[PDB]
Amino acid sequence: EVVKGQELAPGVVSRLDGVALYRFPRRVRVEYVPKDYRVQPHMNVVVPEGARVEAGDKIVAAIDPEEEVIAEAEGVVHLHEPASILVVKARVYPFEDDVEVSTGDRVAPGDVLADGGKV
């Protein structure tokens, strides 16, 4: 949750409020009861932000089935070097169930987005 005029980084500052999603991860740190990987232009993550990993769970995939970020001993997502961060006056609705709404439809306050009738 980024605030208006906040320092997204020591180089640029936001103009509006709302959520500011990040673009590309150049580096991703992990935490074990902690190493760190390095993503490349052709590689991309498949796991959300700040999520715990299992013993063997695919983290950051790529075009090469070899040399990939594989799971380990209880990790945690901690992105570090984003490519860009565009902000949007949108609201965050965390869902853990099923998604009913289609990506490309206008909704109004009240209408159920997902999770049966929670979110």
Side-chain angles (χ1 to χ4, degrees):
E1 299 295 23
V2 179
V3 198
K4 168 198 175 188
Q6 192 185 299
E7 258 234 5
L8 310 164
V12 190
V13 179
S14 121
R15 281 176 177 169
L16 271 177
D17 319 3
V19 183
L21 199 71
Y22 103 109
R23 269 312 191 193
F24 280 27
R26 184 158 290 178
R27 296 196 312 89
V28 176
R29 182 177 302 168
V30 202
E31 287 191 310
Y32 310 135
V33 190
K35 266 292 184 176
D36 195 309
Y37 284 73
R38 283 219 51 172
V39 187
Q40 300 309 299
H42 59 303
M43 313 180 135
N44 68 299
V45 294
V46 193
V47 194
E49 55 170 302
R52 290 171 202 191
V53 70
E54 307 305 288
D57 182 297
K58 187 154 194 165
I59 308 169
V60 193
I63 62 181
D64 43 291
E66 51 95 11
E67 211 83 62
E68 314 183 75
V69 185
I70 306 185
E72 280 171 57
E74 210 180 17
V76 189
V77 172
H78 279 293
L79 319 315
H80 253 312
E81 314 237 66
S84 291
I85 291 121
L86 6 172
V87 64
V88 54
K89 271 193 184 175
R91 289 278 280 285
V92 54
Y93 300 90
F95 85 117
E96 293 89 298
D97 300 48
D98 71 72
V99 51
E100 90 96 77
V101 186
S102 132
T103 328
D105 167 41
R106 283 73 60 194
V107 200
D111 296 51
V112 279
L113 306 165
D115 294 49
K118 291 83 119 296
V119 187

